[PDB]
Write a protein that holds these residues in place. Structure first.
Motif, PDB file in Angstrom:
ATOM      1  N   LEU A   1       0.775  -1.457   0.115  1.00 57.45           N
ATOM      2  CA  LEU A   1      -0.026  -0.110   0.030  1.00 57.45           C
ATOM      3  C   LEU A   1       0.945   1.346   0.201  1.00 57.45           C
ATOM      4  O   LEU A   1       0.680   2.341  -0.574  1.00 57.45           O
ATOM      5  CB  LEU A   1      -1.022   0.054   1.259  1.00 57.45           C
ATOM      6  N   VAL A   2       1.964   1.077   0.796  1.00 60.48           N
ATOM      7  CA  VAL A   2       2.625   2.512   0.692  1.00 60.48           C
ATOM      8  C   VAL A   2       3.439   2.560  -0.538  1.00 60.48           C
ATOM      9  O   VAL A   2       3.717   3.782  -1.154  1.00 60.48           O
ATOM     10  CB  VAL A   2       3.894   1.825   1.895  1.00 60.48           C
ATOM     11  N   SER A   3       4.288   1.368  -1.227  1.00 60.64           N
ATOM     12  CA  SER A   3       4.902   1.393  -2.582  1.00 60.64           C
ATOM     13  C   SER A   3       4.079   2.022  -3.494  1.00 60.64           C
ATOM     14  O   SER A   3       4.480   2.676  -4.445  1.00 60.64           O
ATOM     15  CB  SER A   3       5.518   0.024  -2.959  1.00 60.64           C
ATOM     16  N   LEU A   4       2.584   1.727  -3.594  1.00 58.06           N
ATOM     17  CA  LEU A   4       1.838   2.105  -4.605  1.00 58.06           C
ATOM     18  C   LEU A   4       1.250   3.611  -4.175  1.00 58.06           C
ATOM     19  O   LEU A   4       0.481   4.049  -5.164  1.00 58.06           O
ATOM     20  CB  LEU A   4       0.617   1.051  -4.862  1.00 58.06           C
ATOM     21  N   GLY A   5       1.707   3.998  -3.209  1.00 56.59           N
ATOM     22  CA  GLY A   5       1.097   5.403  -2.870  1.00 56.59           C
ATOM     23  C   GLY A   5      -0.030   5.388  -2.396  1.00 56.59           C
ATOM     24  O   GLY A   5      -0.788   6.727  -2.244  1.00 56.59           O
ATOM     25  N   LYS A   6      -0.740   4.567  -1.723  1.00 59.36           N
ATOM     26  CA  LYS A   6      -2.104   4.354  -1.318  1.00 59.36           C
ATOM     27  C   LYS A   6      -2.028   4.884   0.284  1.00 59.36           C
ATOM     28  O   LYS A   6      -3.242   5.129   0.722  1.00 59.36           O
ATOM     29  CB  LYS A   6      -2.726   3.117  -1.661  1.00 59.36           C
ATOM     30  N   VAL A   7      -0.922   4.869   0.711  1.00 59.40           N
ATOM     31  CA  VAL A   7      -0.757   5.368   2.197  1.00 59.40           C
ATOM     32  C   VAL A   7       0.680   5.937   2.461  1.00 59.40           C
ATOM     33  O   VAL A   7       1.504   5.196   1.596  1.00 59.40           O
ATOM     34  CB  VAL A   7      -1.009   4.139   3.229  1.00 59.40           C
ATOM     35  N   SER A   8       1.072   6.696   3.328  1.00 59.37           N
ATOM     36  CA  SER A   8       2.304   6.989   3.321  1.00 59.37           C
ATOM     37  C   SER A   8       3.184   5.853   3.900  1.00 59.37           C
ATOM     38  O   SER A   8       2.380   4.937   4.824  1.00 59.37           O
ATOM     39  CB  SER A   8       2.755   8.181   4.218  1.00 59.37           C
ATOM     40  N   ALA A   9       4.385   5.963   4.032  1.00 61.56           N
ATOM     41  CA  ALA A   9       5.277   4.959   4.847  1.00 61.56           C
ATOM     42  C   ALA A   9       4.857   5.043   6.434  1.00 61.56           C
ATOM     43  O   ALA A   9       4.925   4.054   7.110  1.00 61.56           O
ATOM     44  CB  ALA A   9       6.689   5.280   4.724  1.00 61.56           C
ATOM     45  N   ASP A  10       4.757   6.335   6.832  1.00 62.34           N
ATOM     46  CA  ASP A  10       4.885   6.394   8.208  1.00 62.34           C
ATOM     47  C   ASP A  10       3.304   5.679   8.638  1.00 62.34           C
ATOM     48  O   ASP A  10       3.158   5.165   9.613  1.00 62.34           O
ATOM     49  CB  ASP A  10       4.630   7.720   8.699  1.00 62.34           C
ATOM     50  N   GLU A  11       2.385   5.848   7.747  1.00 64.02           N
ATOM     51  CA  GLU A  11       1.066   5.337   7.909  1.00 64.02           C
ATOM     52  C   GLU A  11       0.841   3.844   7.837  1.00 64.02           C
ATOM     53  O   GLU A  11      -0.267   3.220   8.727  1.00 64.02           O
ATOM     54  CB  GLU A  11      -0.154   5.809   7.092  1.00 64.02           C
ATOM     55  N   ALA A  12       1.913   3.169   7.576  1.00 58.64           N
ATOM     56  CA  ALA A  12       1.626   1.892   7.529  1.00 58.64           C
ATOM     57  C   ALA A  12       2.121   1.023   8.563  1.00 58.64           C
ATOM     58  O   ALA A  12       2.327  -0.075   8.922  1.00 58.64           O
ATOM     59  CB  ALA A  12       2.292   1.188   6.118  1.00 58.64           C
ATOM     60  N   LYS A  13       3.001   2.040   9.426  1.00 55.04           N
ATOM     61  CA  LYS A  13       3.856   1.446  10.534  1.00 55.04           C
ATOM     62  C   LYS A  13       2.985   1.166  11.805  1.00 55.04           C
ATOM     63  O   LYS A  13       2.162   2.012  12.251  1.00 55.04           O
ATOM     64  CB  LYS A  13       4.957   2.440  10.963  1.00 55.04           C
ATOM     65  N   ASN A  14       3.322   0.367  12.774  1.00 54.78           N
ATOM     66  CA  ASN A  14       2.972  -0.024  13.917  1.00 54.78           C
ATOM     67  C   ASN A  14       3.689   0.997  14.924  1.00 54.78           C
ATOM     68  O   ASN A  14       4.945   0.597  14.985  1.00 54.78           O
ATOM     69  CB  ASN A  14       3.083  -1.524  14.246  1.00 54.78           C
ATOM     70  N   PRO A  15       3.172   1.827  15.651  1.00 58.02           N
ATOM     71  CA  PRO A  15       3.899   2.608  16.163  1.00 58.02           C
ATOM     72  C   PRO A  15       4.889   2.401  17.618  1.00 58.02           C
ATOM     73  O   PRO A  15       5.849   2.709  17.815  1.00 58.02           O
ATOM     74  CB  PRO A  15       3.017   3.957  16.660  1.00 58.02           C
ATOM     75  N   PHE A  16       4.114   0.941  17.966  1.00 53.93           N
ATOM     76  CA  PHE A  16       4.602   0.331  19.120  1.00 53.93           C
ATOM     77  C   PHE A  16       5.658  -0.642  18.736  1.00 53.93           C
ATOM     78  O   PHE A  16       6.596  -1.161  19.743  1.00 53.93           O
ATOM     79  CB  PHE A  16       3.516  -0.471  19.690  1.00 53.93           C
ATOM     80  N   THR A  17       6.004  -0.911  17.476  1.00 52.12           N
ATOM     81  CA  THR A  17       7.095  -1.991  17.239  1.00 52.12           C
ATOM     82  C   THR A  17       7.965  -1.250  16.048  1.00 52.12           C
ATOM     83  O   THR A  17       9.210  -1.720  15.993  1.00 52.12           O
ATOM     84  CB  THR A  17       6.737  -3.123  16.385  1.00 52.12           C
ATOM     85  N   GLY A  18       7.555  -0.448  15.327  1.00 51.64           N
ATOM     86  CA  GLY A  18       8.486   0.295  14.621  1.00 51.64           C
ATOM     87  C   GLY A  18       8.530  -0.444  13.048  1.00 51.64           C
ATOM     88  O   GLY A  18       9.228  -0.046  12.036  1.00 51.64           O
ATOM     89  N   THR A  19       7.681  -1.567  12.778  1.00 45.51           N
ATOM     90  CA  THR A  19       7.703  -2.441  11.850  1.00 45.51           C
ATOM     91  C   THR A  19       6.238  -2.120  11.341  1.00 45.51           C
ATOM     92  O   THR A  19       5.368  -1.760  11.891  1.00 45.51           O
ATOM     93  CB  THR A  19       7.829  -3.992  12.002  1.00 45.51           C
TER      94      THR A  19
END
Length: 174
Positions: free
Chosen positions: A48-66
């Motif tokens: 979703l991030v690579s295709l631009g459907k969400v930012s890189a930051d938006e796909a992240k789990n904020p608790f794990t960083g992954t």
């Protein structure tokens, strides 16, 4: 409050961005992309991030960083008719706070001890009956007869995310 912490605020924003991207993309197709394992689920999120459907930051789990994982699962026995965004690595406190802060954006909520390794671990979006009184497993779903998480029920509030950390919460939609 915990719900206003940097991570909780980001996790709410990210979950919203991701679920919107998922429904906008696949509610038109009728089916969600097959995801056999945890790896396929985190690849979908990164996709979703690579295709631009969400930012890189938006796909992240904020608790794990992954990346949060995105699993496609069955609805009313039909394969890949629903999807669930998985947020793992949660302490009991984070699990309680996250579920009650973003739960209203999702019709389906499944709280598990450990990560979801297979589609089978998620259950069924429409036939899995919720029992928030247990504070574990499916605690919210559209299933006739489900006892969905109700904050006015002290049992639901105390039992939420009961068990052993880390917890992974699957927030599903269709």
């Amino acid at each position: 409050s915990h719900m206003d912490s940097q991570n909780m605020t980001k996790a709410a924003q990210n979950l919203n961005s991701v679920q919107i991207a998922m429904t906008q993309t696949y509610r038109s197709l009728g089916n969600y992309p097959a995801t056999a394992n945890a790896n396929a689920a985190t690849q979908l999120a990164n996709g979703l991030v690579s295709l631009g459907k969400v930012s890189a930051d938006e796909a992240k789990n904020p608790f794990t960083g992954t990346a949060m994982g995105i699993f496609s699962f069955p609805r009313n026995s039909a394969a890949n008719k629903a999807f669930a965004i998985t947020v793992g690595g949660l302490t009991q406190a984070q699990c309680k706070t996250l579920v009650t802060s973003v739960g209203d954006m999702f019709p389906f909520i499944n709280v598990k001890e450990g990560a979801f390794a297979a589609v089978a671990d998620l259950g069924d979006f429409e036939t899995s009956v919720a029992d928030a009184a247990t504070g574990a497993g499916v605690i919210k779903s559209i299933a006739p007869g489900s006892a969905n998480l109700n904050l006015t029920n002290i049992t639901h509030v105390e039992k939420l995310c009961t068990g052993t950390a880390p917890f992974t919460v699957a927030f599903g939609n269709s």
